Amino acid sequence: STIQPGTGYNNGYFYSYWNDGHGGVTYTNGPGGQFSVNWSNSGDFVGGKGWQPGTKNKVINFSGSYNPNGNSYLSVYGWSRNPLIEYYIVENFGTYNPSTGATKLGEVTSDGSVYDIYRTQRVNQPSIIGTATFYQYWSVRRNHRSSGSVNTANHFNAWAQQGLTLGTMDYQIVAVEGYFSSGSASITVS
Ligand SMILES: O[C@@H]1[C@@H](O)[C@H](O[C@@H]2CO[C@@H](O[C@@H]3CO[C@@H](O)[C@H](O)[C@H]3O)[C@H](O)[C@H]2O)OC[C@H]1O
Numbered sequence: 001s002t003i004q005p006g007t008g009y010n011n012g013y014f015y016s017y018w019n020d021g022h023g024g025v026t027y028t029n030g031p032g033g034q035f036s037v038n039w040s041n042s043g044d045f046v047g048g049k050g051w052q053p054g055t056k057n058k059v060i061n062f063s064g065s066y067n068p069n070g071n072s073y074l075s076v077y078g079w080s081r082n083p084l085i086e087y088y089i090v091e092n093f094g095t096y097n098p099s100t101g102a103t104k105l106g107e108v109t110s111d112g113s114v115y116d117i118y119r120t121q122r123v124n125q126p127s128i129i130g131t132a133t134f135y136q137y138w139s140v141r142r143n144h145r146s147s148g149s150v151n152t153a154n155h156f157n158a159w160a161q162q163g164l165t166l167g168t169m170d171y172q173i174v175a176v177e178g179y180f181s182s183g184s185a186s187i188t189v190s
């Protein structure tokens with residue numbers, strides 16, 4: 001069903017839904033691995049379904065519809081702890097490349113596309129442990145898609161070769177993000 005920001009498990013899938021308190025977003029958990037997001041003149045939000053804890057070698061499958069009107073991205077999204085790391089494997093995006101401003105670390109080929117990899121430091125920003133400072137890693141698919149399989153290990157290894165130490169895995173989801181935009185998405189994770 002439709003829910004306010006929070007976390008939990010639904011039909012065997014962890015979910016996380018976060019927003020900045022601005023209105024304009026509706027997040028719905030559906031059967032199995034399915035979730036939907038519908039948004040209209042939103043603020044900042046990110047939510048979706050997957051695993052808690054994730055793993056360092058998961059192959060993540062997703063399919064469905066992704067139709068942003070503005071700034072948004074569809075990604076494998078997760079965290080580690082000790083050290084705190086936020087990471088995104090971006091499969092598709094809207095009007096803004098979310099790696100803008102991050103430092104390019106190289107490239108990796110995975111699951112049918114080259115990806116550009118990046119990192120940046122986030123300072124006194126929201127996180128799974130509260131306001132915190134942490135590195136944020138990106139791997140941005142060149143050949144955008146809204147269904148696919150992601151071998152997360154290829155991305156973790158590419159980042160590690162440029163200095164990532166992944167700590168203890170926290171959640172790991174397929175997420176839809178929006179940033180002052182509109183859109184819809186209906187995604188099934190497995
Ligand atoms: O109540 C606390 C939650 O609000 C908190 O949720 C996390 C807050 O950070 C969210 O981060 C996304 C971090 O980066 C941009 O990439 C995202 O836009 C931030 O908002 C994260 O998605 C939430 O899980 O968890 C701790 C709770 O105590």
Ligand SMILES: O[C@@H]1[C@@H](O)[C@H](O)OC[C@H]1O
Binds near residue numbers: 109110111112113114
């Ligand atoms: O076939 C794919 C090629 O098209 C892509 O660039 O790099 C990945 C391969 O698996």
